[PDB]
Amino acid sequence: LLTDYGNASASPWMKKLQSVAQGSGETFRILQIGDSHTAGDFFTDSLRKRLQKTWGDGGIGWVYPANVKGQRMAAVRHNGNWQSLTSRNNTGDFPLGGILAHTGSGGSMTLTASDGIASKQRVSLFAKPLLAEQTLTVNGNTVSANGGGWQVLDTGAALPLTIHTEMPWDIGFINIENPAGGITVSAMGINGAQLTQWSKWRADRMNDLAQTGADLVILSYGTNEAFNNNIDIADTEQKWLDTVRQIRDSLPAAGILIIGAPESLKNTLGVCGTRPVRLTEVQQMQRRVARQGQTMFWSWQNAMGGICSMKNWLNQGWAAKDGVHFSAKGYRRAAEMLADSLEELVRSA
């Protein structure tokens, strides 16, 4: 299911994962950026809880600053008055991820862990104050911007985490990491999004990517590309290649993993017809990009059983009735196979 068009065993990220496996105390950071499959967190959470069992619970990772409508964090619950805005339907000075929250004056936000660890964790926030040297608090402690513009605030706190804002800030993803090291899986999904739609985010987004410290970047798109009947494959392929180059420039030591689009259906009639007219071309394009960019490629369609499988997963309670989105059990099933492949690769090094 997983093809390596690069050299995983000899790569710096692999060497770091192995060190983490031996309990070196580092944090190995997995960042899946994708569409609605990613934004639901069912696929990514399965991946989270499994890889964390295998190599260590490094903490919840990069999570939303607030509740996002139609999207889901499994590993944190939100309680506050911030308002999330997303690039799905809107414009904005978005940091990497397509997500920001206006806090307003007198703003307040608390994130409480669906489980917990209650000891002081490492905390970073993407954040942009209205005014240059402005402040906010985290569990009562004063945390300060330097200059203005988007930046990462580095601090430390225990969960539950309460952020107060006397005057307005915009806040992006927030990083929460166990200081004992281990694995984090971060889910940066936008409902309906395509990979080329990083262009909706701010110009310095690659600078943001560099600040996430991701050691493995998983790109999960293709579904919505496939639903554009007039997509230019040739042109799209370039922008995919160029996006891969940019990732490599900004995170020279990261591994890159491309998840080929799973089978989706235009309609659900008669032995898994009908596929979107352009699905196959997008799938084949993704593999080509993987190979040229020396990336890893996980075939989600093969993982399902190959062509004509969506109706079967549909019949099996693994897919939604729309033939495009999966059920919770469906995502957990698919993520487990990815996990399998990842552990198989590392075991093989």
Side-chain angles (χ1 to χ4, degrees):
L1 299 183
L2 182 71
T3 315
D4 184 25
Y5 291 112
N7 197 340
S9 74
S11 60
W13 66 263
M14 174 62 67
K15 183 190 283 193
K16 184 187 174 180
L17 215 221
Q18 282 171 306
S19 292
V20 168
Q22 273 87 284
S24 70
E26 283 167 295
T27 300
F28 187 90
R29 304 178 182 98
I30 303 185
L31 174 59
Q32 180 162 323
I33 318 170
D35 48 30
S36 78
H37 307 303
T38 301
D41 208 25
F42 284 111
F43 183 98
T44 49
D45 186 43
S46 169
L47 201 65
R48 198 138 52 224
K49 306 211 157 313
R50 164 74 172 275
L51 299 190
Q52 272 175 347
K53 233 304 181 191
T54 302
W55 296 312
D57 196 341
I60 70 182
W62 292 101
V63 301
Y64 298 167
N67 283 317
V68 173
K69 169 170 198 286
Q71 306 188 190
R72 172 180 177 266
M73 291 278 352
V76 247
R77 70 174 205 75
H78 292 86
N79 187 12
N81 56 21
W82 299 359
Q83 187 52 59
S84 60
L85 185 66
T86 235
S87 67
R88 167 182 186 273
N89 292 131
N90 290 274
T91 61
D93 186 24
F94 298 107
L96 196 260
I99 289 186
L100 66 81
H102 308 297
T103 66
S105 54
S108 183
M109 183 58 239
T110 135
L111 306 109
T112 101
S114 286
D115 301 339
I117 204 179
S119 64
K120 280 182 203 51
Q121 293 182 248
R122 309 190 302 236
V123 175
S124 283
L125 312 75
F126 280 95
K128 174 181 59 178
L130 177 50
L131 241 50
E133 321 296 333
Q134 197 175 334
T135 69
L136 49 74
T137 64
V138 183
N139 291 9
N141 292 320
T142 300
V143 169
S144 283
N146 300 279
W150 283 106
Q151 55 194 272
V152 173
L153 268 32
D154 289 341
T155 186
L159 264 41
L161 192 74
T162 294
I163 316 178
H164 284 332
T165 204
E166 160 67 18
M167 289 294 280
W169 287 69
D170 285 335
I171 309 283
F173 276 76
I174 294 175
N175 194 32
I176 310 172
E177 289 174 341
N178 188 327
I183 308 287
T184 71
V185 178
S186 301
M188 277 182 178
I190 297 293
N191 281 345
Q194 289 169 57
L195 175 63
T196 64
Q197 296 176 302
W198 290 14
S199 69
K200 282 160 142 174
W201 309 341
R202 77 202 194 95
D204 284 327
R205 53 191 177 262
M206 293 301 97
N207 293 353
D208 293 333
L209 180 63
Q211 303 224 54
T212 70
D215 301 301
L216 171 57
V217 177
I218 301 175
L219 300 176
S220 182
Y221 301 86
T223 297
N224 292 110
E225 277 89 354
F227 267 83
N228 179 2
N229 290 339
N230 311 119
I231 188 172
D232 189 338
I233 295 291
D235 177 76
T236 299
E237 182 166 346
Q238 280 291 347
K239 310 255 197 191
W240 274 61
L241 278 167
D242 181 86
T243 305
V244 166
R245 294 189 298 271
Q246 282 172 200
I247 298 168
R248 295 208 178 289
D249 296 346
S250 294
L251 288 172
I256 307 184
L257 186 252
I258 294 183
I259 299 203
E263 180 172 74
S264 59
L265 304 181
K266 240 306 188 306
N267 68 71
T268 61
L269 304 173
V271 202
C272 227
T274 321
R275 290 166 56 95
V277 171
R278 306 306 304 280
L279 175 59
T280 296
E281 286 162 279
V282 180
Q283 292 178 320
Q284 285 179 7
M285 182 229 290
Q286 297 178 288
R287 183 187 289 274
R288 278 202 304 281
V289 171
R291 185 173 167 178
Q292 176 70 29
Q294 298 174 235
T295 245
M296 281 162 295
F297 178 79
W298 190 71
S299 171
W300 192 342
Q301 172 161 301
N302 289 338
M304 290 173 69
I307 204 170
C308 183
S309 60
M310 172 48 99
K311 192 69 183 307
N312 296 320
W313 277 47
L314 232 163
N315 286 334
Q316 225 119 357
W318 289 333
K321 66 144 103 77
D322 70 357
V324 181
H325 304 92
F326 295 82
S327 63
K329 296 189 185 299
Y331 288 120
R332 300 187 232 107
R333 181 172 174 93
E336 282 199 19
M337 307 188 218
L338 172 54
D340 287 349
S341 305
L342 259 23
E343 297 175 18
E344 167 50 45
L345 183 67
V346 166
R347 189 157 64 241
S348 128

